[PDB]
């Protein structure tokens, strides 16, 4: 559950690695102010409209094989 | 070179806001977490403008505000998060116009992870054992008792953490004084990425999962 | 002799592991009763799993001498 | 030191009579009481009287 | 030689520590310069878990601590710093 | 026969003593279900249906006896294994398992887990077997200890959760019959649990109905025991359900039978104190008869009416709070001389609420309740009632505070003076609580003579081993402040009569008490008792006792702190040779105080000694710093320093580089850290160019045993290092280089304890060109050498930030090697758990393939 989530190992997937990568990315940004409030002046969106796109985003983000 | 830094002009940006008899009487009062800085504003109805008493620097990340005001109280607690897991349940003191932290609880290490608690804060006004839970499978419940002096006891974290179920939203539903109901929008994640075709982006939407914290059980059950 | 025993002129500094090695020389032990109250210190009571593993501490301990004193056991009713 | 010593004595003699003196009033106001108490003379029983 | 812990939720439960493993960090295991305070889970005070030392693992004489060099680096927010291991488990001599 | 059974067959006064603390081997107790491991008990091959349940018990023995992941796989295999395993079996095994007295306390809370797995597993099942539960869990729930009873309460709650609340009412209603009160008081404590987890408002109307009747006084009285046992049970969950529980609990306030009215009475305190302090409208449907039948009941009725109102009063408000209390005064002050116990101790709490109300103000206190509180309490009458000793005085503490210090400092020094050493020690405990509570302002120039007089005839007439007249002096004179100097010689007399006793516990007691106010008094400014207190000190140096001779040392202690040098009667060049063998004792006490006696005598003046004297008493300190009671090596470090800065850094640098060789790794690790005292006793260029030149010596340990000072050097220097940190790295470098396996984990450590020190002081330089070498250090199959380097690098990132330590180990995350990237890896993950959200702004730009979106093009924005 919360052994080690966030990181793989000696044989992770470079794509592996780069969904961990953007889905501990967007959490700094759902989460952070600054990275929140300067992402809502280049899309020109709310805060609660660039939230529900990042959250929606962290479904399968950096292209998935789903 | 040396240089130390100044604010010269505080922020301005009302990120949060919470309302409710945070003074202890009836009148009302705005906390606004803008950041950094943490502020309380009194909306005063002879003057019509909104008097901004304290703007303390918090040094930290504010993820959520939710206050509370327990079964048959005067002032309301305020719970905070920050970067790290240290909740912040503060409550109010006007001898000197000063805050005061209530009870300061270490939850889970520092940085707004995705598996770190400390981003959505949902109390429940009819009842106790509020949630502190994190974007992904990551959420306490703490239960607020009163002592015989009315103290705000935290108890022990009943964890209701997921499995790879991204989250939503949480708010906790008042209840009929039954076991308190909490609703989160929760999206299991973790069924979707394991398929190689990719069809995996349909058929998986969010849902909400209510799970009620029953003191009886002394766990935080679905 | 009944199954549950008293005996008398306990110390009053010991733990429960010299109490289970004492009472593990002759068989085993399925309760033990600890006196925690000022009137009734110095006296405890104890009861076996087996009868004859009673009987037989309740004869083997009758007369014990330990810590420069004497034992006295009592057969409750 | 043999004139302190002596003073330090002294001072100690004056200090145990004064102690009996006061022990001898507590002794006497005492008596004085048990002419006469006190709550209603052996309130004990009154309010028992049985059960 | 390398001991396990608990790292369950940690509770509202203070540490101890016994008369001779009272110093060192639960953690750390140093001596040098007691930053914070230790704490518990909830299967870590429960009847006869009452007041134990989080190191030696019996008699309680002080409040466990941790080490300020593991306390700044974030050690302390792990789960249930008791130390228990397959050895030092639940039915231990 | 069970546990529950066999503890009523014990009478009061006693406690059961638990049991101390592949599978493993068996046991003799676990004889009951043994026979699948140690005989041919073929479950499968010929027995009855569903028979292997039984071999579960066995398995439950795993659980009990066997490892903790083969004792839980049991309970995880039984959880999805319960509604195929027969919920009477299942129950008849289940329960006369833990129903036997061997049950032990891991065992209870295991057999409590495994139960409440059942239920939930069985939920319509477990109906049935109410019968079973109630008749085993109640006895539990009613146990002594109080996890017996929170284990009995858990059980009954989720065997009330496990079925329905019309299952638990029609099973706790019949059990009613149970004459026997021992009985029946188990039936409620059981519906109360039940009614605590299942819903209050769930079983109130059902509880309402069943009880609101007129059968008889049996069922009357177990609905207030019920009442008072889910209000006790719940505890502050009792403020919604107060009216709701209150409408159907006054029906007793008016009752015919005594009992019931007791009962009701009792509920309604319980009630009280649950839903204490605020939320008294519910008690408003009551207050009007608990005010008026305070003054009307008789015996048991006023009893449980003073009862009620000891617990209404401090939730009452402040207009009706006055009213009701001169309702209760005519029947409380009255009656304040209680026949027997059950009546005062009622009292006594009442009188302690209300003076804890803010009703009653300090005025009414000293008018009405002042001069009966002196009459019928304030007296030598409760010499020897141990309970009424520490209720009047818990009382009397309480009161003093709103009446007033001086109104009981000029009326209770009578009590303490007086001959009965019984009633004189529960009343130096009284004015000691009264003086720490309120302190020295209301202190009368005859009250405090008078507290004087009676503090030192209790001291002298100490003809029994009471310490509260010990602890009460210290409180009385530090109470005395300033006014102890005119006091001087009274004190002074009493502490020579006290200390030239020649008595053991008589000269302990003087000796503590000196200690105690030996800072209020030789701290006066006198310069005339410091050699009458010197001459009898020193004089009793060789006490066999040793209490007495730790105390002679903390008096001595005292006595140096407050007097110095020469101004102290015994000679510093005569005490530290009479204390130098005295510090050489392993006793714990002695040893603690005599180390903190050392310490002091280089306090203010330090000289006073030889240089070998003082050389001598650091070598054999030396050996202490490491002892097993952590006061004794906190005051040896406490000490060292001040030994340190008064003989020189030069000699005790240069005789602690010499102890270095000797005293073999055993103990010798010490010896280094205290050096690093050196360092914390003085300037760092103390140390460090001394132990520079220990370094140029070729031999292996001995810049081995140099690295490993070094290392507790900057793991306890804090952070002072920042101030000379570029003048050690060469010395840590060429430590770091390929010279052997054991000076690489010194070096390692060294840097990860300045890091920490130096963490953000400006002295990243010097942490990049010692990280420059430990970086390539990091390819080590040493087992007991990797985590050397593993603490460096987790060092590192907390005090180096990721930005570096992450865009050092970018390079080979994906590198071809199994065994390189099984440490690449590793180390990531030790980077990436510290400061999570930190290293995010701190990756590379990954190019985006043909097949994904990998680069992450949300933050390239221009705003």
């Given at each position: 559950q919360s052994k080690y989530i966030g990181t793989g190992h000696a044989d992770t997937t470079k794509w592996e690695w780069l969904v961990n990568q953007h889905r501990d990315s967007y959490c700094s940004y759902m989460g952070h102010?600054?990275?929140?409030?300067?992402?809502?002046?280049?899309?020109?969106?709310?805060?609660?409209?660039?939230r529900?796109?990042l959250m929606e985003k962290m479904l399968q983000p950096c292209?998935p094989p789903a | 070179?040396?240089?130390?830094?100044?604010?010269?002009?505080?922020?301005?940006?009302?990120?949060?806001?919470?309302?409710?008899?945070?003074?202890?009487?009836?009148?009302?009062?705005?906390?606004?977490?803008?950041?950094?800085?943490?502020?309380?504003?009194?909306?005063?109805?002879?003057?019509?403008?909104?008097?901004?008493?304290?703007?303390?620097?918090?040094?930290?990340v504010?993820r959520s505000?939710m206050?509370?005001?327990?079964?048959?109280?005067?002032?309301?607690?305020?719970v905070?998060g920050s970067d790290s897991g240290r909740i912040?349940?503060?409550?109010?003191?006007?001898?000197?116009?000063?805050?005061?932290?209530?009870?300061?609880e270490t939850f889970g290490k520092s940085g707004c992870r995705r598996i770190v608690p400390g981003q959505f804060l949902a109390v429940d006004?009819?009842?106790?054992a509020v949630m502190i839970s994190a974007i992904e499978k990551q959420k306490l419940v703490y239960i607020l008792?009163?002592?015989?002096?009315?103290?705000?006891?935290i108890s022990s974290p009943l964890e209701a953490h997921k499995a790879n179920t991204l989250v939503y939203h949480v708010v906790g539903?008042?209840?009929?004084?039954?076991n308190p109901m909490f609703a989160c929008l929760e999206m299991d994640y973790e069924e979707a990425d394991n398929d190689?075709?990719?069809?995996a982006a349909?058929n998986t939407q969010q849902t909400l999962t209510f799970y009620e914290l029953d003191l009886g059980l002394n766990h935080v059950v679905r | 002799?009944?199954?549950?025993?008293?005996?008398?002129?306990?110390?009053?500094?010991?733990?429960?592991?010299?109490?289970?090695?004492?009472?593990?020389?002759?068989?085993?032990?399925?309760?033990?009763?600890?006196?925690?109250?000022?009137?009734?210190?110095?006296?405890?009571?104890?009861?076996?799993?087996?009868?004859?593993?009673?009987?037989?501490?309740?004869?083997?301990?009758?007369?014990?001498?330990?810590?420069?004193?004497?034992?006295?056991?009592?057969?409750?009713? | 030191?043999?004139?302190?010593?002596?003073?330090?004595?002294?001072?100690?003699?004056?200090?145990?009579?004064?102690?009996?003196?006061?022990?001898?009033?507590?002794?006497?106001?005492?008596?004085?009481?048990?002419?006469?108490?006190?709550?209603?003379?052996?309130?004990?029983?009154?309010?028992?009287?049985?059960? | 030689?390398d001991l396990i812990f608990c790292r369950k939720q940690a509770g509202v439960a203070?540490g101890?520590?016994?008369?001779?493993?009272?110093?060192?960090?639960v953690i750390?295991?140093?001596?040098?310069?007691?930053?914070?305070?230790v704490r518990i889970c909830d299967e870590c005070n429960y009847?006869?878990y009452?007041?134990?030392?989080v190191?030696?693992?019996?008699?309680?004489?002080?409040?466990?601590?941790y080490?300020?060099?593991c306390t700044?680096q974030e050690k302390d927010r792990d789960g249930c710093p008791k130390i228990v291991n397959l050895g030092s488990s639940k039915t231990?001599? | 026969?069970?546990?529950?059974?066999?503890?009523?067959?014990?009478?009061?006064?006693?406690?059961?003593?638990?049991?101390?603390?592949?599978?493993?081997?068996?046991?003799?107790?676990?004889?009951?279900?043994?026979?699948?491991?140690?005989?041919?008990?073929?479950?499968?091959?010929?027995?009855?249906?569903?028979?292997?349940?039984?071999?579960?018990?066995?398995?439950?023995?795993?659980i009990?006896?066997g490892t903790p992941p083969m004792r839980k796989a049991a309970l995880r295999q039984i959880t999805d294994k319960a509604?195929?395993?027969?919920?009477?079996?299942?129950?008849?095994?289940?329960?006369?398992?833990?129903?036997?007295?061997?049950?032990?306390?891991?065992?209870?809370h295991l057999?409590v887990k495994v139960?409440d797995r059942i239920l939930y597993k069985?939920?319509?099942?477990?109906?049935?077997?109410?019968?079973?539960?109630?008749?085993?869990?109640?006895?539990?729930?009613?146990?002594?200890?109080?996890?017996?009873?929170?284990?009995?309460?858990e059980?009954?709650?989720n065997?009330?959760?496990?079925?329905?609340?019309?299952?638990?009412?029609?099973?706790?209603?019949?059990?009613?019959?149970?004459?026997?009160?021992?009985?029946?008081?188990?039936?409620?404590?059981?519906?109360?649990?039940?009614?605590?987890?299942?819903?209050?408002?769930?079983?109130?109307?059902?509880?309402?109905?069943?009880?609101?009747?007129?059968?008889?006084?049996?069922?009357?009285?177990?609905?207030?025991?019920?009442?008072?046992?889910?209000?006790?049970?719940?505890?502050?969950?009792?403020?919604?359900?107060?009216?709701?529980?209150?409408?159907?609990?006054?029906?007793?306030?008016?009752?015919?039978?005594?009992?019931?009215?007791?009962?009701?009475?009792?509920?309604?305190?319980?009630?009280?104190?649950?839903?204490?302090?605020?939320?008294?409208?519910?008690?408003?449907?009551?207050?009007?008869?608990?005010?008026?039948?305070?003054?009307?009941?008789?015996?048991?009725?006023?009893?449980?009416?003073?009862?009620?109102?000891?617990?209404?009063?401090?939730?009452?408000?402040?207009?009706?709070?006055?009213?009701?209390?001169?309702?209760?005064?005519?029947?409380?002050?009255?009656?304040?001389?209680?026949?027997?116990?059950?009546?005062?101790?009622?009292?006594?709490?009442?009188?302690?609420?209300?003076?804890?109300?803010?009703?009653?103000?300090?005025?009414?206190?000293?008018?009405?309740?002042?001069?009966?509180?002196?009459?019928?309490?304030?007296?030598?009458?409760?010499?020897?009632?141990?309970?009424?000793?520490?209720?009047?005085?818990?009382?009397?503490?309480?009161?003093?505070?709103?009446?007033?210090?001086?109104?009981?400092?000029?009326?209770?020094?009578?009590?303490?003076?007086?001959?009965?050493?019984?009633?004189?020690?529960?009343?130096?405990?009284?004015?000691?609580?009264?003086?720490?509570?309120?302190?020295?302002?209301?202190?009368?120039?005859?009250?405090?003579?008078?507290?004087?007089?009676?503090?030192?005839?209790?001291?002298?007439?100490?003809?029994?081993?009471?310490?509260?007249?010990?602890?009460?002096?210290?409180?009385?004179?530090?109470?005395?402040?300033?006014?102890?100097?005119?006091?001087?010689?009274?004190?002074?007399?009493?502490?020579?009569?006290?200390?030239?006793?020649?008595?053991?516990?008589?000269?302990?007691?003087?000796?503590?008490?000196?200690?105690?106010?030996?800072?209020?008094?030789?701290?006066?400014?006198?310069?005339?008792?410091?050699?009458?207190?010197?001459?009898?000190?020193?004089?009793?140096?060789?006490?066999?006792?040793?209490?007495?001779?730790?105390?002679?040392?903390?008096?001595?202690?005292?006595?140096?702190?407050?007097?110095?040098?020469?101004?102290?009667?015994?000679?510093?060049?005569?005490?530290?040779?009479?204390?130098?063998?005295?510090?050489?004792?392993?006793?714990?006490?002695?040893?603690?105080?005599?180390?903190?006696?050392?310490?002091?005598?280089?306090?203010?003046?330090?000289?006073?000694?030889?240089?070998?004297?003082?050389?001598?008493?650091?070598?054999?300190?030396?050996?202490?710093?490491?002892?097993?009671?952590?006061?004794?090596?906190?005051?040896?470090?406490?000490?060292?320093?001040?030994?340190?800065?008064?003989?020189?850094?030069?000699?005790?640098?240069?005789?602690?580089?010499?102890?270095?060789?000797?005293?073999?790794?055993?103990?010798?690790?010490?010896?280094?850290?205290?050096?690093?005292?050196?360092?914390?006793?003085?300037?760092?260029?103390?140390?460090?160019?001394?132990?520079?030149?220990?370094?140029?010596?070729?031999?292996?340990?001995?810049?081995?045993?140099?690295?490993?000072?070094?290392?507790?050097?900057?793991?306890?220097?804090?952070?002072?290092?920042?101030?000379?940190?570029?003048?050690?790295?060469?010395?840590?470098?060429?430590?770091?280089?390929?010279?052997?396996?054991?000076?690489?984990?010194?070096?390692?450590?060294?840097?990860?304890?300045?890091?920490?020190?130096?963490?953000?002081?400006?002295?990243?330089?010097?942490?990049?060109?010692?990280?420059?070498?430990?970086?390539?250090?990091?390819?080590?199959?040493?087992?007991?050498?990797?985590?050397?380097?593993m603490?460096?690098?987790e060092?590192?990132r907390v005090?180096?930030?990721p930005?570096?330590?992450?865009?050092?180990?970018?390079?080979?995350l994906?590198?071809?090697?199994?065994?390189?990237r099984d440490?690449?890896w590793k180390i990531y993950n030790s980077i990436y758990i510290g400061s999570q959200d930190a290293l995010i702004?701190?990756?590379?730009?990954?190019?985006?393939?043909?097949?994904?979106?990998?680069?992450?093009?949300?933050?390239?924005?221009?705003?």
């Amino acid at each position: 559950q919360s052994k080690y989530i966030g990181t793989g190992h000696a044989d992770t997937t470079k794509w592996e690695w780069l969904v961990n990568q953007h889905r501990d990315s967007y959490c700094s940004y759902m989460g952070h102010f600054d990275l929140l409030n300067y992402f809502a002046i280049a899309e020109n969106e709310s805060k609660a409209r660039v939230r529900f796109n990042l959250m929606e985003k962290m479904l399968q983000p950096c292209g998935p094989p789903a | 070179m040396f240089l130390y830094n100044l604010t010269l002009q505080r922020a301005t940006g009302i990120s949060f806001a919470i309302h409710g008899n945070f003074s202890g009487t009836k009148q009302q009062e705005i906390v606004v977490s803008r950041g950094k800085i943490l502020e309380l504003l009194r909306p005063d109805p002879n003057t019509g403008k909104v008097h901004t008493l304290l703007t303390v620097e918090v040094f930290g990340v504010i993820r959520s505000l939710m206050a509370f005001r327990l079964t048959g109280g005067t002032k309301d607690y305020i719970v905070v998060g920050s970067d790290s897991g240290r909740i912040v349940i503060l409550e109010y003191q006007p001898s000197k116009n000063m805050f005061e932290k209530i009870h300061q609880e270490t939850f889970g290490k520092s940085g707004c992870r995705r598996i770190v608690p400390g981003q959505f804060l949902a109390v429940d006004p009819k009842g106790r054992a509020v949630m502190i839970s994190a974007i992904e499978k990551q959420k306490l419940v703490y239960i607020l008792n009163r002592d015989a002096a009315a103290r705000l006891t935290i108890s022990s974290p009943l964890e209701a953490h997921k499995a790879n179920t991204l989250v939503y939203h949480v708010v906790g539903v008042d209840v009929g004084f039954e076991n308190p109901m909490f609703a989160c929008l929760e999206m299991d994640y973790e069924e979707a990425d394991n398929d190689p075709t990719g069809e995996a982006a349909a058929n998986t939407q969010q849902t909400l999962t209510f799970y009620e914290l029953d003191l009886g059980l002394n766990h935080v059950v679905r | 002799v009944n199954r549950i025993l008293y005996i008398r002129n306990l110390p009053y500094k010991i733990t429960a592991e010299e109490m289970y090695d004492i009472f593990g020389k002759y068989g085993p032990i399925r309760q033990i009763r600890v006196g925690n109250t000022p009137e009734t210190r110095g006296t405890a009571y104890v009861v076996y799993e087996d009868i004859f593993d009673a009987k037989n501490a309740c004869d083997h301990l009758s007369g014990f001498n330990v810590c420069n004193r004497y034992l006295v056991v009592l057969y409750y009713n | 030191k043999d004139a302190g010593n002596f003073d330090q004595n002294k001072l100690e003699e004056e200090m145990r009579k004064r102690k009996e003196r006061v022990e001898k009033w507590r002794e006497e106001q005492r008596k004085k009481a048990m002419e006469n108490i006190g709550e209603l003379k052996k309130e004990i029983e009154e309010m028992k009287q049985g059960k | 030689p390398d001991l396990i812990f608990c790292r369950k939720q940690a509770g509202v439960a203070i540490g101890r520590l016994c008369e001779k493993c009272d110093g060192k960090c639960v953690i750390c295991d140093s001596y040098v310069r007691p930053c914070t305070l230790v704490r518990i889970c909830d299967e870590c005070n429960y009847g006869s878990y009452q007041g134990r030392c989080v190191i030696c693992g019996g008699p309680g004489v002080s409040d466990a601590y941790y080490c300020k060099e593991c306390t700044i680096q974030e050690k302390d927010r792990d789960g249930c710093p008791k130390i228990v291991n397959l050895g030092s488990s639940k039915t231990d001599l | 026969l069970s546990d529950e059974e066999l503890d009523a067959m014990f009478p009061e006064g006693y406690k059961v003593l638990p049991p101390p603390a592949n599978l493993p081997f068996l046991k003799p107790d676990d004889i009951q279900y043994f026979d699948k491991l140690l005989v041919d008990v073929d479950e499968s091959t010929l027995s009855p249906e569903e028979q292997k349940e039984r071999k579960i018990m066995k398995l439950l023995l795993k659980i009990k006896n066997g490892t903790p992941p083969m004792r839980k796989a049991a309970l995880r295999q039984i959880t999805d294994k319960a509604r195929e395993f027969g919920a009477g079996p299942l129950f008849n095994q289940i329960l006369p398992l833990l129903m036997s007295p061997t049950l032990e306390d891991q065992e209870r809370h295991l057999l409590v887990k495994v139960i409440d797995r059942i239920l939930y597993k069985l939920d319509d099942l477990v109906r049935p077997y109410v019968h079973k539960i109630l008749v085993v869990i109640e006895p539990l729930l009613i146990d002594e200890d109080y996890y017996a009873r929170v284990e009995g309460r858990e059980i009954i709650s989720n065997l009330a959760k496990a079925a329905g609340l019309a299952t638990m009412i029609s099973t706790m209603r019949p059990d009613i019959d149970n004459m026997d009160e021992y009985v029946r008081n188990t039936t409620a404590r059981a519906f109360a649990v039940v009614a605590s987890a299942l819903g209050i408002p769930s079983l109130l109307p059902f509880l309402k109905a069943v009880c609101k009747s007129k059968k008889s006084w049996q069922a009357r009285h177990t609905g207030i025991k019920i009442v008072q046992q889910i209000a006790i049970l719940m505890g502050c969950a009792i403020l919604p359900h107060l009216r709701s529980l209150v409408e159907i609990i006054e029906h007793g306030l008016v009752d015919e039978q005594q009992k019931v009215r007791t009962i009701s009475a009792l509920a309604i305190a319980a009630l009280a104190e649950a839903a204490t302090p605020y939320g008294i409208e519910s008690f408003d449907s009551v207050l009007k008869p608990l005010w008026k039948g305070i003054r009307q009941h008789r015996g048991k009725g006023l009893a449980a009416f003073l009862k009620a109102i000891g617990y209404l009063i401090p939730l009452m408000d402040a207009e009706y709070a006055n009213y009701y209390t001169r309702e209760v005064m005519l029947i409380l002050i009255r009656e304040f001389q209680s026949p027997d116990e059950e009546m005062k101790k009622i009292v006594l709490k009442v009188v302690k609420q209300c003076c804890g109300t803010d009703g009653v103000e300090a005025n009414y206190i000293k008018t009405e309740i002042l001069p009966p509180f002196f009459k019928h309490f304030w007296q030598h009458r409760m010499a020897l009632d141990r309970r009424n000793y520490r209720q009047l005085v818990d009382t009397t503490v309480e009161l003093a505070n709103k009446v007033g210090a001086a109104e009981i400092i000029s009326r209770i020094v009578d009590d303490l003076k007086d001959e009965a050493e019984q009633y004189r020690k529960m009343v130096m405990e009284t004015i000691e609580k009264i003086m720490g509570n309120l302190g020295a302002a209301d202190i009368d120039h005859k009250l405090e003579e008078q507290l004087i007089d009676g503090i030192l005839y209790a001291f002298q007439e100490q003809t029994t081993e009471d310490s509260v007249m010990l602890n009460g002096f210290g409180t009385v004179v530090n109470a005395l402040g300033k006014r102890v100097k005119p006091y001087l010689p009274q004190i002074c007399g009493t502490v020579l009569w006290r200390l030239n006793n020649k008595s053991a516990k008589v000269r302990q007691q003087a000796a503590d008490l000196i200690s105690r106010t030996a800072v209020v008094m030789k701290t006066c400014q006198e310069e005339k008792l410091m050699g009458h207190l010197g001459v009898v000190l020193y004089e009793y140096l060789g006490e066999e006792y040793p209490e007495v001779l730790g105390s002679i040392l903390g008096a001595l202690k005292a006595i140096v702190n407050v007097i110095g040098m020469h101004k102290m009667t015994p000679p510093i060049k005569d005490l530290l040779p009479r204390l130098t063998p005295i510090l050489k004792n392993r006793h714990e006490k002695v040893q603690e105080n005599c180390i903190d006696l050392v310490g002091r005598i280089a306090d203010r003046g330090a000289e006073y000694v030889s240089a070998r004297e003082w050389m001598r008493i650091c070598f054999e300190l030396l050996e202490l710093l490491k002892a097993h009671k952590k006061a004794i090596r906190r005051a040896t470090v406490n000490t060292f320093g001040y030994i340190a800065k008064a003989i020189g850094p030069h000699d005790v640098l240069a005789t602690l580089l010499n102890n270095l060789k000797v005293q073999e790794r055993q103990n010798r690790v010490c010896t280094t850290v205290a050096i690093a005292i050196v360092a914390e006793t003085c300037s760092p260029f103390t140390v460090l160019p001394a132990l520079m030149n220990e370094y140029r010596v070729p031999e292996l340990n001995v810049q081995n045993g140099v690295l490993k000072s070094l290392s507790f050097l900057f793991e306890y220097i804090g952070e002072m290092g920042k101030d000379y940190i570029y003048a050690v790295t060469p010395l840590l470098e060429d430590a770091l280089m390929d010279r052997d396996l054991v000076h690489r984990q010194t070096a390692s450590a060294v840097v990860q304890h300045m890091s920490l020190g130096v963490y953000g002081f400006g002295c990243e330089d010097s942490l990049n060109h010692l990280l420059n070498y430990v970086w390539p250090n990091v390819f080590e199959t040493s087992p007991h050498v990797i985590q050397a380097v593993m603490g460096a690098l987790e060092g590192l990132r907390v005090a180096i930030g990721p930005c570096r330590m992450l865009q050092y180990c970018l390079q080979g995350l994906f590198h071809p090697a199994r065994k390189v990237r099984d440490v690449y890896w590793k180390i990531y993950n030790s980077i990436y758990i510290g400061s999570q959200d930190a290293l995010i702004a701190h990756y590379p730009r990954i190019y985006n393939d043909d097949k994904n979106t990998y680069i992450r093009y949300e933050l390239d924005y221009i705003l």
